[PDB]
């Protein structure tokens, strides 16, 4: 069933987005 492969790729795409989010998200600094 090739259709079962349809979500999983999108899933790892989100994982890439997660890594991209971890590339976009950084360190939080407090300034007075």
């Amino acid at each position: 069933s090739p259709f079962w492969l349809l979500p999983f790729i999108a899933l790892m795409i989100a994982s890439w987005l997660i890594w991209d989010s971890y590339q976009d998200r950084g360190n939080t600094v407090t300034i007075d």
């Binding site: 069933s1 259709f3 079962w4 349809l6 979500p7 999108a10 899933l11 989100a14 987005l17």
Partner: protein, 392 residues
């Protein structure tokens, strides 16, 4: 003479049907057969006049907007081209297929069927495509979208009706009145003639392609169309589960990531769907209500309905059988309207295109929203009510 219901497996004799007469299943009350109606030549003439009217309907501007002393004209093609130039080719392609491609494919199918009458080429997948294509012809939805957008930007600037708006309205009316009389089983019986049964066999199956009742051949294929004939669908449960899970997964990036970016005097807004609908509720709640109920209510409703149906199939619950079928019918009827948001944002980004004062752009979230809508539509269409009826 005698047929079987395609949704609940009810074998019943079919009486003769007149023009205004209609037939329904005695058990589940589902539409089964029709006839008479119009002829193929009238449909060919309608396709020809649609082909004449479409280029001067899409090409001409829909409405002129006078923003900051500058007159701007826009149409569908300009919006799709700006979407492609932005980078979102997939969103532009799906908008193109939903709005522009479907009438072209309909005209091409009618012309190819007429040339098959003239010549004699094979027409087996063409009829299946013609029967399944009545769902995706959404031109009136685009009319509602341009009306909503015109109401939305009425306060920002001055709006005047364009020349091509009348041609677009005429095209929409013609497509509606042509699709309201397009009968498929009449074409099937005219091109391919068959014979009835002895009214009592208890061995006739229903083809999922042409709604035909008859014995399978030695090859297992339908006698009317070259597809295999089975009792139920092959892997409807697994495909439905996979599509539903894919839609659920893709829903979250559609809602969390920003959908529209408004550069205002050099500063961008970058607000998501929730922020946009909150601002619309704050400003123009009268249209924000219908946008809310036709944008985010329908997808969540479809998702929860499909999840409950799958859990009822697993659970073999026989308590709400009389209502699950009606809920499925309502979900199938209402899943088409979910594409309104993409049309609205396309028209707004085509209209509001000031150089630096006002720049409306589509963010990297409409792709996931469109993918979720397509996936949930396919999930609803892929399911079969006969599994629910046999779950008793």
């Amino acid at each position: 003479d005698y047929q079987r219901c395609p949704q609940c497996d009810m074998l019943f004799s079919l009486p003769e049907i007149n023009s205004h007469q209609s037939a329904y299943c005695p058990r589940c009350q589902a539409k089964i057969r029709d006839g008479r109606d119009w002829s193929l030549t009238r449909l060919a003439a309608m396709a020809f006049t649609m082909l004449l009217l479409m280029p001067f309907a899409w090409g001409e501007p829909l409405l002129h907007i006078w923003l900051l002393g500058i007159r701007i004209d826009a149409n569908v093609m300009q919006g799709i081209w700006q979407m492609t130039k932005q980078g979102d080719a997939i969103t532009g392609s799906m908008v193109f297929f939903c709005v522009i491609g479907a009438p072209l494919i309909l005209v091409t199918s009618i012309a190819y069927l007429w040339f098959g009458n003239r010549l004699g080429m094979n027409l087996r997948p063409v009829l299946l495509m013609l029967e399944r294509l009545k769902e995706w012809v959404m031109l009136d939805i685009y009319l509602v979208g341009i009306g909503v957008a015109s109401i939305k930007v009425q306060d920002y600037a001055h709006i005047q009706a364009g020349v091509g708006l009348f041609s677009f309205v005429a095209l929409v009316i013609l497509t509606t009145v042509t699709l309201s009389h397009l009968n498929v089983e009449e074409l099937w019986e005219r091109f391919y003639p068959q014979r009835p049964a002895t009214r009592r066999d208890e061995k006739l199956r229903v083809c999922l392609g042409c709604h035909f009742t008859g014995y399978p051949d030695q090859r297992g294929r339908c006698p009317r169309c070259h597809i295999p004939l089975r009792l139920r669908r092959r892997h409807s449960l697994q495909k439905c589960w996979a599509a539903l899970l894919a839609s659920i997964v893709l829903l979250l990036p559609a809602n969390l990531l920003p959908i529209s970016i408004i550069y205002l005097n050099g500063g961008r807004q970058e607000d998501t769907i929730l922020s946009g609908i909150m601002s619309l509720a704050s400003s123009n709640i009268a249209v924000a209500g219908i946008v809310f109920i036709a944008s985010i209510l329908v997808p969540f409703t479809k998702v929860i309905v499909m999840f409950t149906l799958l859990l009822s199939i697993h659970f073999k619950c026989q308590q709400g059988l009389r209502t699950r079928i009606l809920l499925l019918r309502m979900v199938t009827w209402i899943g088409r309207w979910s594409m309104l948001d993409l049309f609205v944002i396309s028209l707004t980004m085509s209209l509001i295109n000031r150089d630096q004062i006002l720049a409306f752009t589509m963010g990297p979230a409409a792709f996931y929203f469109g993918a979720a809508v397509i996936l949930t539509i396919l999930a609803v269409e892929w399911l079969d009510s006969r599994l629910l009826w046999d779950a008793h």
